[PDB]
Amino acid sequence: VQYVDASRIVIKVNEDEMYPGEAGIDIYNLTKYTRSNQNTCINQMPCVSLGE
């Protein structure tokens, strides 16, 4: 992990699961405070630290 995370989790990929071209690190979008269909709050919080 690179963990910029304020905006997105940035995951460096191990080489065995990583394609030869497209060097590639996976950037996950966290959906912060927003409306659900029943007016509840759907919110995602990172549960992994930096360098883990």
């Binding site: 963990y3 910029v4 995370d5 304020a6 905006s7 912060k32 630290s49 930096l50």
Partner: protein, 230 residues
């Protein structure tokens, strides 16, 4: 009238927070009366300082997020609501927390003044991950009792404050857990006396003999309405 009077004989500190205290000697039957009365008063009505308004720069509302941190802003407000402060002179102070660099933000990083004492130097607040990230919050610490929440303190506040100051709920009471025991007293000529072993658990900010003295004064000044008038 063959009654006696009790004194605080031995005050042992098991730790900085959890600390017992004896009371000796009590009369027959008085043990559960004083123990339950001091329990109710010591859980309801003690004065302790807590976080009330948090002012972070560049953050409008509490449901946003910030650059370079782990906990979100609601997590920061909860971890600040758990804080344990002990002021001496004033009744309303403003602290400052400024820190940059990768690593967690302890409570020991607040640039203290002279009369404020932060008694938990391992209380975590933030987890700064970017080295180009900074955080500069300005906390406001009042002093009261009971529980006064954000909804009631939404119009109660008279001093017209500016907009941008996040309102944190006020958990003012620094006593969290208290138990009393009525043992058998070791009196060299009396067998019908007992001791009261109050086992407090504080927020670290309150001094137990001072807390017991204040609760006793509260009980005596409440009973003066029975004593004087009828």
């Amino acid at each position: 009238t063959e009654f006696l009077k009790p004194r605080l004989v031995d005050i042992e500190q098991v730790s900085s927070t959890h600390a017992k205290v004896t009371l000796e000697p009590l009369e027959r039957g008085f043990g559960h009366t004083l123990g339950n009365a001091l329990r109710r008063i010591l859980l309801s009505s003690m004065p302790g300082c807590a976080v009330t308004e948090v002012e972070i720069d560049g953050v409008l509302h509490e449901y946003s997020t910030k650059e370079g941190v782990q906990e979100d802003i609601l997590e920061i407000l909860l971890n600040l609501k758990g804080l344990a402060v002990r002021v001496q002179g004033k009744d309303e102070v403003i602290l400052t927390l400024n820190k940059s660099g990768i690593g967690p933000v302890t409570a020991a990083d607040i640039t203290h003044d002279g009369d404020v004492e932060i008694v938990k130097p391992q209380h975590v607040i933030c987890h700064l991950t970017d080295e180009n990230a900074s955080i500069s919050m300005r906390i406001k610490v009042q002093r009261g009792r009971g529980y006064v929440p954000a909804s009631t303190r939404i119009h109660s506040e008279e001093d017209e404050r500016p907009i941008g100051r996040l309102l944190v709920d006020a958990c003012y009471s620094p006593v969290e857990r208290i138990a009393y025991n009525v043992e058998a007293a070791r009196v060299e000529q009396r067998t019908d006396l007992d001791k009261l072993v109050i086992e407090m658990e504080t927020n670290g900010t309150i001094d137990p003999e001072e807390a017991i003295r204040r609760a006793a004064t509260i009980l005596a000044e409440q009973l003066e309405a029975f004593v004087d008038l009828r």
